[PDB]
């Protein structure tokens, strides 16, 4: 009955493709702003976006620790689920090949004995691509 979206995330190095760490999805925030639009024959949709994410239970790849402009990719793995069909064989693949290790924990020194290394992420962008986030349907 619980939300059946225990998505698995693979954090891999875009530079070559090595696996950095794997975690379990926690949240994903989507927001936009249009303040800059204010100052259009040459109309422009001045509604930039910012995709914030967070993951939980990060397990670091042994080799990535071993060896230790650096870009990283995120591969979200989720099973498809419909109202008509509670469970769907098809799996939706979400990927954010361009992210940053968003600093937001920022040395949270809580004095409790809780093993919560939540990692925040920011989906980076470029001139050519407004935002790298990509979706695909297995069906």
């Amino acid at each position: 009955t619980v939300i059946q979206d225990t998505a698995d995330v693979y954090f891999k190095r875009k530079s070559d493709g090595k696996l950095v760490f794997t975690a379990e999805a926690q949240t994903a925030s989507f927001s936009q702003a249009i303040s800059e639009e204010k100052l259009k024959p040459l109309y422009i949709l001045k509604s930039e976006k910012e995709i914030n994410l967070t993951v939980k239970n990060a397990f670091f790849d042994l080799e990535w620790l071993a060896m230790t402009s650096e870009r990283y990719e995120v591969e979200y793995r989720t099973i498809a689920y419909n109202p008509d069909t509670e469970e769907v064989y098809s799996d939706i693949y979400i990927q954010f090949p361009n992210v940053s290790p968003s600093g937001e924990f920022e040395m949270s020194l809580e004095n409790g004995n809780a093993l919560a290394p939540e990692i925040k992420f920011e989906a980076l962008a470029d001139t050519d691509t407004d935002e790298m986030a990509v979706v695909i349907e297995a069906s």
């Binding site: 619980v2 059946q4 093993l115």
Partner: protein, 997 residues
């Protein structure tokens, strides 16, 4: 780095005897029974001067050269003695100072010793290394080195520096160094010797830094020989010599009665690697200090049985608290996943869970082991424990089940209360039921009875629960008596004393100067060790965890709302709900009286308020295309029976009003209508029984009226049966106190149930009975409607008229035909109910009286007897407006105010604005009130007095007329759109959308 790995390799290969020694040392440390005997061997590691050095020095001074030979034990004592008598004590003092006055660093062993939290520490050393190691750790050991010291010790913990030291001074008089000192030990240190002996007898002994053949060791062995056989715990010796202890040596020194551990056997090391051997022993102990002794994958069932077997007593406990059982070795999340938190030995529980998954592997268990596994598996299901988190599949969240006390059953609790109590557990539940039923005096006395009976039966658990329950009910009686003597005498008029004054005095004298903070502290050691789970109840600051978890989860859910994040997995709302239900079950099913206290009120209130708020938001939330991709048609928040019970009990009227106002709770579908209908009809039956009968309990009344008040108020959402609706309305109209629910509250809650479901003709009969009763009740002229809300019985008649287009209240008509002029008050009230009474009776009332003044004009025009505003009626309004004007100009000198006159003034202004009254004197009275001018002459009226009530307390036809007038429309729309912009309100939004634009 691999020192710990090498030591854990040493472990799992240690001789069983040595392993057992280590275990006993461990459990002694946990129990606070450890006493560490610290010899000079530990001081040797710290470089502290060795005694042989001073002995050789004395030999040198005495005979001019060293011995160049082994000093025997007597020589080690004689040489200092001869030197003391020959050179005098001055030279002894000098050499003592030169050698032993040297600071050292506390070696790793010094720190590891104080890391065991020893009950006391004994040492035959004269250094202050142990003192500094004690001070740095934060604890405080009271030093003892003299007869004077034994008397002076502020703390229970003592640092017993036997054989004195040099803290008083660097003199031999305060240390045992020479034959004279050792021989007369008892002479000079009698009290120290006795304190040392008792400390040895009571607490576990650990010889470290010592030699197996030391003098004090032998003295203690003569003392343990004096002891009665099997009345002494074998002291613990830590051999650190590089050479391996011989078998003969082990046999002999065990025969002496010593549990000796030999570092050479445990670990290999060089011949001068003393520090490595000491550290090996001590880090072995420290390593296995918390649930590290896991035998094997065949002992999994056995290990977990020993860990859990004492826990079978409790019927159910929160899974968050299951961490304490294994010393945080495994975190059981609220859902039930076994999140591995800390473990060294394999198959701690994963083997057991595998046995659950694999039937054949379970079959490999011994029959004893199979039964133990079965019992453990049953207990874990009873606690809700879900399979290992590593293999956790989809996890269903089911509502926690509770007992009848949580339910709204009241006759069954009396049934039990009259029944014979088989065991003290039954009597404990009985006293809980008495407390729930308001019978707090009988509940308290019966709780004292169970206190005595249980502690007679040595039910440590039930005794603990009964202790706290007795404290809680004591507090209940004390506070309730306070509120009684303070206000309850005002609430009814004469103070009730169900709790007799002598009974109060006896209770106050029975207990005092006691706080439950130490309730857990006073219990036996087995109870405190095995049942730390119940320490959560110990303190007076109950809910020492759940409240702040609720707070931070609110913060997280609120942030989720404002930013609108598409959460995954067990969201914060789900963990909030799991904590809510687990706490409700653990309390109500366990029978603690705390369930009714205000802390739990706030906790449950805030839990369900947040849950419903999130239920509203997720409905209104817009979905982005990527959001729809993540999920669509997502799960909502079903309001099952349990939710209705929780909300109805733990909320009050105002908070439910706030919840309904903010959150459109009516949209939220409810379920389990059968059980909630049973609960509601049960509450109605209870109030009907309590008020039908003159006999009742004020003590039960105060507690349960709020419960009944909220439950009936929340009853609107769920559907009732025809029998249920009839019982509800009859319990409300005829058996609900006027003290708390006045006539107006009575009407409005009736109206809530009316909106809920249509009122059959039987309910029409009930309302008519109410109306006729009020008509007859006004036989007294003194009688007059009293209701804070201003909602009267004429409202009830209006409901009948709304439901039934045609219905004659024949009883009211008959009453009219019976009235006379002397009964003018009954006449007035029956006039108020004119639409209900018949035609001949209507003629009766019309002949009796009619309009005479402004009040009576309002009365007449209200039901509408007057179809057209007569010239006389408008003229009378003009006359009362002249009265208001003269009173205003008179009040102009005073402080002008309007509370009820402003109602009439606004009515006339509206009628003039509606063009109903053409009387132009209305315009002459312009200016006495802002609303009057705003209505009669909006153009002249200054568009700055617009009240928020005017802007929201509107009328639909009045709204249409306002929208018609452009002059008023411009200002009203400007201010209204402004007001909604400043603060988003639904009512202003509907003013805006529906009519103005």
């Amino acid at each position: 780095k691999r020192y710990g790995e090498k030591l854990k390799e040493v472990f799992l290969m240690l001789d069983n005897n040595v392993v057992e020694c280590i275990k006993e040392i461990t459990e002694s440390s946990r129990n606070g029974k450890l006493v560490f005997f610290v010899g000079a061997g530990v001081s040797t590691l710290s470089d502290y001067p060795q005694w042989w050095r001073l002995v050789d020095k004395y030999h040198e001074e005495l005979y001019g050269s060293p011995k160049k030979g082994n000093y025997s034990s007597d020589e080690y004592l004689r040489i200092p003695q001869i030197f003391y008598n020959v050179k005098g004590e001055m030279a002894f003092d000098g050499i003592l100072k030169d050698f032993f006055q040297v600071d050292k660093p506390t070696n790793p062993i010094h720190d590891k010793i104080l890391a065991m939290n020893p009950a006391h520490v004994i040492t035959t050393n004269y250094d202050n290394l142990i003192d500094t190691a004690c001070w740095k750790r934060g604890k405080y050991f009271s030093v003892i080195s003299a007869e004077e010291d034994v008397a002076n010790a502020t703390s229970s913990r003592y640092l017993l520096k036997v054989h004195g030291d040099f803290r008083k001074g660097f003199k031999g008089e305060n240390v045992v160094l020479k034959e004279d000192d050792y021989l007369n030990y008892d002479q000079n240190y009698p009290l120290i010797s006795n304190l040392m002996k008792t400390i040895i007898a009571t607490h576990t002994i650990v010889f470290i830094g010592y030699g197996l053949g030391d003098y004090n060791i032998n003295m203690l062995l003569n003392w343990v020989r004096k002891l009665q056989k099997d009345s002494f715990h074998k002291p613990f010796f830590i051999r650190t010599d590089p050479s391996p202890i011989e078998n003969e040596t082990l046999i002999y020194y065990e025969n002496k009665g010593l549990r000796i551990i030999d570092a050479a056997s445990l670990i290999d090391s060089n011949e001068y690697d003393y520090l490595e051997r000491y550290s090996a022993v001590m880090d072995l102990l420290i390593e296995s200090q918390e649930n590290k002794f896991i035998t094997k994958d065949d002992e999994v069932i056995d290990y977990i049985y020993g860990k859990i077997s004492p826990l079978f007593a409790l019927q159910y406990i929160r899974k968050i608290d299951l961490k304490h059982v294994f010393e945080y070795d495994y975190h059981f999340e609220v859902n039930g996943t076994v999140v591995r938190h800390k473990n060294k030995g394999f198959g701690y529980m994963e083997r057991f869970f595998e046995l659950k998954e694999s039937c054949d592997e379970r079959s490999k268990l011994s029959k004893k082991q199979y039964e133990r596994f079965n019992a453990l598996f049953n207990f874990f299901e009873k606690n809700g424990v879900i399979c290992m988190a590593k293999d956790a599949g989809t996890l269903n969240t089911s509502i926690e089940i509770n007992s009848l006390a949580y339910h709204g059953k009241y006759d069954v609790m009396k049934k039990f209360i009259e029944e014979q109590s088989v065991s003290i557990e039954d009597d404990y539940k009985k006293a809980f039921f008495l407390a729930c039923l308001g019978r707090w005096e009988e509940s308290y006395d019966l709780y004292s009875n169970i206190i005595l009976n249980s502690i007679d039966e040595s039910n440590g658990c039930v005794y603990y629960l009964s202790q706290i329950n007795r404290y809680r009910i004591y507090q209940s009686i004390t506070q309730a008596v306070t509120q009684f003597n303070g206000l309850g005498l005002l609430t009814f008029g004469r103070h009730y004393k169900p709790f007799t004054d002598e009974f109060l005095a006896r209770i106050e004298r029975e207990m005092t100067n006691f706080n439950i903070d130490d309730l857990f502290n006073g219990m036996p050691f087995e109870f405190q060790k095995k049942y730390k789970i119940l320490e959560f109840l110990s303190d007076n600051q109950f809910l020492y965890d759940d409240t702040v978890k609720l707070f931070e989860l609110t913060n997280k859910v609120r942030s989720e709302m404002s930013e609108g994040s598409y959460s995954f997995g067990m969201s914060s709302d789900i963990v909030v709900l799991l904590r809510l239900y687990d706490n409700l079950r653990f309390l109500y099913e366990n029978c603690l009286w705390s369930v009714s206290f205000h802390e739990f009120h706030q906790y449950i209130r805030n839990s369900m308020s947040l849950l419903i708020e999130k239920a509203e938001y997720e409905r209104t939330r817009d979905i982005d295309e990527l959001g729809f991709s993540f999920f669509g048609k997502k799960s909502g928040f079903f309001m099952e029976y349990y939710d209705f019970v929780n909300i109805s009990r733990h909320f009050k009227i105002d908070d439910i009003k706030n919840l309904e106002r903010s959150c459109s709770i009516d949209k939220i579908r409810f379920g389990e209508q059968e059980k909630i209908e049973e609960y509601l009809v049960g509450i109605a039956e209870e109030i009907t029984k309590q008020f039908s009968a003159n006999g009742m309990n004020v003590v039960f009344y105060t507690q349960f009226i709020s419960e009944a008040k909220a439950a009936l108020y929340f009853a609107k959402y769920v559907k009732l049966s025809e029998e249920g609706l009839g019982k509800i309305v009859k319990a409300l109209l005829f058996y609900f106190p006027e003290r708390d629910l006045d006539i107006g509250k009575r009407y409005v809650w009736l109206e809530r149930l009316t909106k809920c479901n249509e009122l059959p003709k039987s309910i029409i009969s009930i309302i008519d009975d109410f109306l006729v009763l009020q008509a007859e009740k006004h036989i007294d002229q003194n009688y007059s409607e009293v209701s804070s809300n201003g909602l009267y019985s004429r409202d009830y008649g209006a409901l009948i008229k709304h439901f039934e287009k045609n219905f004659i209240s024949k009883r009211l008509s008959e009453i009219t035909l019976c009235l006379t002029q002397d009964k003018q008050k009954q006449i007035d009230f029956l006039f108020k109910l004119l639409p209900l009474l018949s035609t001949n009776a209507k003629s009766h009332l019309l002949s009796f009286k009619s309009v005479e003044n402004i009040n009576d004009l309002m009365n007449g025009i209200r039901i509408g007897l007057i179809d057209e505003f007569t010239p006389e009626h408008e003229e009378l309004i003009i006359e009362y407006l002249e009265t208001r004007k003269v009173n205003y100009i008179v009040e102009k000198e005073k402080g002008i105010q309007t509370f009820s006159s402003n109602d009439y003034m606004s009515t006339f202004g509206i009628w003039y604005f509606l063009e109903e009254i053409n009387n132009s004197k209305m315009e002459e009275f312009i200016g006495m009130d802002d609303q009057y001018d705003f209505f009669v002459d909006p153009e002249n009226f200054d568009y700055k007095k617009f009240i928020p009530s005017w802007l929201k307390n509107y009328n639909d036809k009045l709204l249409g007329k306002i929208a018609g007038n452009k002059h008023m429309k411009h200002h009203v729309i400007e201010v209204l759109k402004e007001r909604v912009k400043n603060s988003n309100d639904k009512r202003y939004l509907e003013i805006l959308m529906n009519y103005f634009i």
